[PDB]
Amino acid sequence: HMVKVALAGCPNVGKTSLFNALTGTKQYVANWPGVTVEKKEGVFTYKGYTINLIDLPGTYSLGYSSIDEKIARDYLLKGDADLVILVADSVNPEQSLYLLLEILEMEKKVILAMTAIDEAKKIDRYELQKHLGIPVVFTSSVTGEGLEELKEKIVEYAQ
Secondary structure, three states: OEEEEEEEEOOOOOHHHHHHHHHOOOEEEEEOOOOOOEEEEEEEEEOOEEEEEEEOOOOOOOOOOOHHHHHHHHHHHOOOOOEEEEEEEOOOOHHHHHHHHHHHHHOOOEEEEEEOHHHHHOOOHHHHHHHHOOOEEEOOOOOOOOHHHHHHHHHHHHO
16 A cells, blocks of 8 residues: 655654654655755655655744745645654654644644654653544654654554
C-alpha cells in the first residue's frame, strides 16, 4: 500500500533531523507550487507499506499570514495526506501542543513524535497519550530510538 504522511511542527523541534532519519538519501528538494519556498519530500518502505513523507514548513500557527503558514494550512485543508506526524519538543511542549489543537481541527489522524528526549531527561508517555487520545512516540533521530514504534503507528493509522 501507499501512505501519504505529512510532517508538521513549530520551527526548531527536530523536524528536519527526523525527516532525514526516516528517508535517508531517498529524498529530494523542490519548490512548493508557484512560490520560491523549498519543499522536501521522500520515501521509505516499512512492512509492505510505501510511505511518501512530505515535510511541511515550520509553523507556530496555521492561522498566521506568512507564506510558510499558508502553505502548511492549505496543504492540511486539502487533505491529500493520509495522516500527520506532529513533531514536538519535549523540553518545552507548549507551542507544539497549541499547534496540535489546530491540526486536529483539520486532520484527526495525528501521531505526536516527541524529540529532544535525551536533553529532556537532563514526561510519562502513557499519561500524555491517555490525555491526548492519540499515539505519542518518543524519538531520537540520532540513535534511532522510537523510529520503529513511529513507523508501527503510521501503519496502524493507514489501516
